[PDB]
Amino acid sequence: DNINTLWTGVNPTEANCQIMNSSESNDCKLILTLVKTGALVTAFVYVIGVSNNFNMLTTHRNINFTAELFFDSTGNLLTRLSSLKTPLNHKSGQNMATGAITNAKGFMPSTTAYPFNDNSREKENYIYGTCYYTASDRTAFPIDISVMLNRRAINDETSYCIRITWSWNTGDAPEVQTSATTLVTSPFTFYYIREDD
Amino acid sequence: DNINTLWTGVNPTEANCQIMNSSESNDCKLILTLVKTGALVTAFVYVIGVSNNFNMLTTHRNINFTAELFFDSTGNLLTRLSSLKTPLNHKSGQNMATGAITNAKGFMPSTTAYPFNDNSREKENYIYGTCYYTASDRTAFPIDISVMLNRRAINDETSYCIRITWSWNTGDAPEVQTSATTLVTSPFTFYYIREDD
Amino acid sequence: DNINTLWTGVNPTEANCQIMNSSESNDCKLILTLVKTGALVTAFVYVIGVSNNFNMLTTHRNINFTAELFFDSTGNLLTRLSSLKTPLNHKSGQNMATGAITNAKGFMPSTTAYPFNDNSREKENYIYGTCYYTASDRTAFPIDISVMLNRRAINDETSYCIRITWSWNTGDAPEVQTSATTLVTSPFTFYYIREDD
């Protein structure tokens, strides 16, 4: 059953993702778990902030950040182009397994269900939902999430795309500078029709 | 694993569903994927509009449309009574497999969890959530979704029912006539306790 | 596949849960289904009210009630400390199987992903979402749901914790005394990274 999961592992020691291009290094831990579920992938995702600049986004009224995930034709993460810098792997306890995936193409968003560059079908490339930031006062602050699958390639090397955008546009920021600690999002689970191996 | 999915296939060429009774033919593509997940079915559903009359619903402030899915005692779609006119089948790549289902009863909503004609238990027959229409300005327009399982049969032939209602009641329509194109809903995933085979 | 589910069974005859400490006995049926899905558990939960005092909560503007689920190191329900008084079991038709679980540890919330007593990681212990009460006028009344995993133990015996809180804080109650019947919540499905066996 371990091969039915493609994931980041649980709570890596170091930030594995540069979600802001304004950062000088990886600025958060992107926790991403993809599970093969029949014709679908169950996708489970959140961020644990690390860098101060990312963590202090909780003091802003308007925020938008995107984890751009690009994969080659074999379903392997293109780390040089992607926000996530650590390739995914199968489940091994609470950690990533060692070597070499590629039933991985089977975890990718279907190019039949989610096309590239098709303006007449562009609405089909989008998934939306809500996750939450737990504020210092323990209230659940709603964060809008938008997932775009495929749709726009960077180059001929990028055969699959998963772009996950967290955003909010509220009357007030969830924190002030004196109350802000770590930007963590609650797990968001979404589903998509998967490519075949 | 292909037999664990019962679905419509991906993006059929022609509309497979008459979701408005006001239409003169099938007016949209109902994409429906049911996956057996332990004691539950994971149900994944959305519509891709085809007919102009259905697509132009995006210019209305108040809209309601329901995909009524009726199945016989073996879990086979009663196409003559249902909004969906194309029987479901197992996964074969991105398409439907050929012949003959019926581990299909195992994909049906449980008559023990979701009874028929039981007013004292009627609240148990309902699932709710939210999906989204991607407007021409790329904003996510929230659409209310209500699923009623079993509860009300058409006749003695209809052993199982899945009624999926999309609706919105807003201060403004998501589109004007000059901006409206295709009514597509983002995938909605819901869960229910499944009947046994 | 029956062993991949840990659940309460469907619609037990008697209330199996004391969700209000103000009740004189079990006051509702907690329907809980946990399904192993790759590295995750798919958790499916709702309540069917039984006692009048619980059912009449629908006449209040502000309500909060929590199902506290505590498990020992083997993943078995500590009924003496928990809101749920009926141990979970595997799937057997629409009912619970007989004897003895414990691939059950594998259904528990990961202590690596969801730590105990770690203030610096506390935001990671929370999941949120929305479910709905179907009011007498058939409108869907939104109920806020908050799940806290692990985080706070009662004693050294409680190795795992799932605390599920339903709440609402609205301008008006969903019912009046003359219209109120049964407090039923629509199924809420959430996901978490699971402990290994």
Curated annotation (Swiss-Prot), chains A, B, C:
Q: Does the keyword Phosphoprotein apply?
A: no
Predominant localisation class = virion
Entry keywords, A to Z: Capsid protein, Host nucleus, Host-virus interaction, Late protein, Viral attachment to host adhesion receptor, Viral attachment to host cell, Virion, Virus entry into host cell
UniProt KW Nucleotidyltransferase keyword: no
Localization, per the record, is: Virion; Host nucleus
Q: Which GO terms describe its biological process?
A: adhesion receptor-mediated virion attachment to host cell; cell adhesion; symbiont entry into host cell
Report the superkingdom from the record.
Viruses
A GO cellular component term found in this entry reads: viral capsid
Q: What induces it?
A: Expressed in the late phase of the viral replicative cycle.
The record comments on the domains as follows:
The tail region anchors the fiber to penton base capsomers, whereas the shaft, built from several repeated motifs, allows the knob to protrude from the virion.
Assembly information from the UniProt record: Homotrimer. Interacts with host receptor CD46. Interacts (via N-terminal tail region) with pentons.
Q: What does this protein do?
A: Forms spikes that protrude from each vertex of the icosahedral capsid. Interacts with host receptor CD46 to provide virion initial attachment to target cell. Fiber proteins are shed during virus entry, when virus is still at the cell surface.
- What family does the Swiss-Prot or TrEMBL record give for this protein? Belongs to the adenoviridae fiber family.
General remark: All late proteins expressed from the major late promoter are produced by alternative splicing and alternative polyadenylation of the same gene giving rise to non-overlapping ORFs. A leader sequence is present in the N-terminus of all these mRNAs and is recognized by the viral shutoff protein to provide expression although conventional translation via ribosome scanning from the cap has been shut off in the host cell.
What is the name listed in the Swiss-Prot or TrEMBL entry for this protein? Fiber protein
Q: Which organism is it from?
A: Human adenovirus B serotype 11 (strain Slobiski) (HAdV-11)
